[PDB]
Write a protein that binds this ligand. Structure first.
Ligand SMILES: O=C(NO)c1ccc(-c2csc3c(=O)cc(N4CCOCC4)oc23)cc1
Length: 131
């Protein structure tokens, strides 16, 4: 039984935009979304169809780049560091659930190695954007 996808909207929670959140959605995500191994992390993990035992019991915070992307388009994140946590949650969940060295781990590691390179290009200073 797969739970509903994580909320990408917050009808009671602050809606905000940033030149850093702008660089994330328009640069680092495009570069990640077009990566060779970026297809398993474009949507929520289908544990039932993949028959991953006790996945949602081991993984308390299921996350994926499809959820992260829609959150960037709905100004779900207050700042950029909040968005970097969803990427760290996504990667670590794969490292916690799978054997070190497996294909799915290697694909998240290469995807993460590029992510750490890309976010290092974000603006050091945070400036709001007129949303
Ligand atoms: O659509 C797909 N393939 O056609 C696909 C594949 C894999 C994933 C995926 C993302 S994270 C993750 C994971 O943690 C463990 C497992 N495994 C470990 C056991 O073998 C089957 C895979 O699948 C994932 C998502 C989509």
């Amino acid at each position: 039984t797969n739970p509903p996808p994580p909320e990408t909207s917050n009808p009671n929670k602050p809606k905000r935009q940033t030149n850093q959140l702008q660089y994330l959605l328009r640069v680092v995500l495009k570069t990640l979304w077009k990566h060779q191994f970026a297809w398993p992390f474009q949507q929520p993990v289908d544990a039932v169809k993949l028959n991953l035992p006790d996945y949602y019991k081991i993984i308390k915070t299921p996350m994926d780049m499809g959820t992260i992307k829609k959150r960037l388009e709905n100004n779900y994140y207050w700042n950029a560091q909040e968005c970097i946590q969803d990427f760290n949650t996504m990667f670590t969940n794969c490292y916690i659930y799978n054997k070190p060295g497996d294909d799915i781990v290697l694909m998240a590691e290469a995807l993460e190695k590029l992510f750490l390179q890309k976010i290092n290009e974000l603006p050091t200073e945070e400036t709001e954007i007129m949303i």
